[PDB]
Design a binder for this molecule. Structure first.
Ligand SMILES: Cc1cc(S(=O)(=O)N(Cc2cccc(CN)c2)[C@H](C)C(=O)NO)ccc1F
Ligand SMILES: [Zn+2]
Length: 488
């Protein structure tokens, strides 16, 4: 148990002894992000802004996850309208931990993406370049095949959709065998865009870590020793998935993931070939020029191969459930504007089809899915889970709804082009029926339309007939738009 640890520490002893205090402080910052002091945050707020924060329904937002929602209440004591939300978009930018590994994962290593303040962007960059320079010693040719390294991971880090149901709801000690097969099916390779922190000895799983990686390094894999029996691995490494089994440890069930480090360029080649194949297949099915590049794989993180494989399934569901003529007409419009279907595992603000048109960082959006009219692109984020979405296919269809909204309004007036949902016809329909469908449907006309569009093309035909019944004018309006497009 401790012999492996002693030999690893020995191998890196000179490297460790050689670390400056600055180098040590940096490794520490990497392991422990610097959290915002709830103290400081309030002292920067004005009187009217403090008042607005206290009187704001904190847990009732869209943009705030459990981390930021909780942090905001934490000083709600210590102290929704459009005003409240414009405020919250700005405030969200000032409460992010300084977190080097999170910056690397969010950007997929593309750290110059204009998704954070330039000054902090350069700080991250310096820290990352300095850590890279620290990690120069390889594990070597005598140790690499004699040791295993381990990482406990939350299933939600890879797929939040499947992670909702990975644990047997009847018996939490068991893994749902069916969901396991779907997690495993298309899981052949993995990318680490940040620095993996791994244990020399397998650690008992703590709360919400049902994935237990066992990893074999390559001789060239650079790493550094961390106190208490850990390694930090260089960033940008490829991992080939060798085996995925259900195992039992202390009368509970876990998923063992065996992986082998390989050159990242090997994985990136696989991803690029796959991007070629899916474009060729779909250019044909859509009747587009053979060389059209419509589908982008922007893939950099640990569930890489599944982002790739699920795009196929998402586009099949797309084609199965939407009229062929509608798909061809709208997609041609998108390609006319140099549009893309972007399937990605980095956050959407770090996607150029969004940030190229959204200079203000407080206006950048991360979410399961996005449609960006300025670049005619649909963005779909693999790892996350959309509220009130059952799967990614449905998310895509919603975003394509936004594209339908775009194109039909263009056809109305093609010199100066607006969204159909901005026409006074739809606006009136929306103030009547806008509350009759989904909760998120209520947000505005664009979302109501896209939601109605999604529901109208559910595989569940109960959900379809509910639109017809509960929102007959919306239902009617959309079929009209669809007809109008197909006939153009
Ligand atoms: C129902 C549904 C929801 C989404 S979504 O990706 O979750 N979403 C809305 C949203 C909701 C809650 C929290 C956030 C921020 N975390 C964002 C975004 C903005 C959207 O409308 N894109 O077009 C996507 C497709 C869908 F069909
Ligand atoms: Zn939307």
């Amino acid at each position: 148990r401790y012999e492996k640890w002693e030999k690893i520490k020995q191998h890196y002893q000179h490297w460790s002894d050689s670390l400056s205090e600055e180098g040590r402080g940096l490794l520490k910052k990497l392991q422990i992000p610097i959290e915002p002091k709830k103290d400081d945050i309030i002292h920067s707020l004005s009187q009217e802004e403090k008042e607005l924060l206290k009187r704001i329904q904190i847990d009732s937002s869209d943009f705030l996850s459990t981390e930021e929602k909780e942090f905001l209440k934490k000083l709600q004591i210590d102290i929704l309208s459009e005003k409240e939300k414009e405020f919250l978009k700005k405030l969200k930018l000032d409460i992010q931990p300084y977190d080097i590994n999170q910056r690397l994962q969010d950007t997929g290593g593309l750290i110059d993406s204009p998704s954070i303040n330039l000054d902090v962007r350069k700080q991250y960059k310096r820290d990352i370049q300095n850590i890279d320079a620290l990690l120069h010693q390889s594990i070597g040719s005598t140790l690499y095949n004699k040791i295993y390294l381990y990482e406990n991971m939350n299933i939600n880090n890879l797929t939040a959709t499947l992670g909702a149901d990975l644990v047997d709801s009847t018996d939490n000690t068991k893994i749902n065998r069916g969901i396991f097969n779907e997690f495993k099916k298309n899981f052949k390779y993995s990318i680490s865009s940040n620095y993996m922190i791994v244990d020399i000895n397998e650690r008992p799983a703590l709360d919400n870590e049902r994935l237990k990686w066992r990893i074999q390094l390559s001789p060239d894999t650079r790493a550094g020793y961390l106190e208490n029996g850990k390694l930090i691995l260089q960033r940008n490494i490829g991992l080939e998935i060798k085996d995925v089994q259900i195992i039992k440890q202390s009368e509970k069930e876990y998923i063992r993931i065996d992986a082998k480090v390989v050159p990242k360029s090997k994985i990136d080649t696989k991803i690029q070939e796959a991007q070629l194949n899916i474009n060729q297949e779909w250019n044909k099915a859509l009747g587009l020029p053979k060389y059209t590049k419509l589908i982008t794989f922007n893939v950099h993180n640990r569930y890489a191969s599944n982002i790739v494989e699920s795009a196929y399934l998402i586009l099949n569901e797309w084609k199965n459930n939407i009229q062929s003529d509608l798909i061809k007409k709208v997609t041609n419009y998108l390609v006319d504007g140099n549009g893309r279907f972007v399937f990605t595992d980095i956050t959407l603000p770090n996607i150029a089809e969004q940030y190229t048109h959204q200079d203000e960082i407080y206006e950048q959006v991360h979410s399961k899915g996005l449609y960006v009219p300025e670049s005619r692109s649909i963005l779909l984020h693999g790892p996350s889970k959309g509220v009130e979405l059952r799967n990614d296919s449905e998310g895509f269809i919603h975003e394509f709804g936004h594209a339908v909204d775009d194109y039909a309004g263009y056809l109305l007036d093609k010199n100066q082009s607006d969204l159909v949902t901005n026409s006074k016809k739809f606006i009136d329909i929306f103030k009547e029926e806008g509350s009759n469908l989904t909760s998120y449907g209520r947000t505005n006309e664009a979302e109501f339309f896209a939601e109605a569009f999604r529901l109208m093309h559910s595989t569940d035909h109960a959900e379809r007939l509910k639109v017809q019944k509960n929102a007959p004018k919306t239902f009617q309006f959309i079929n009209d738009q669809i007809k109008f497009i197909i006939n153009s």
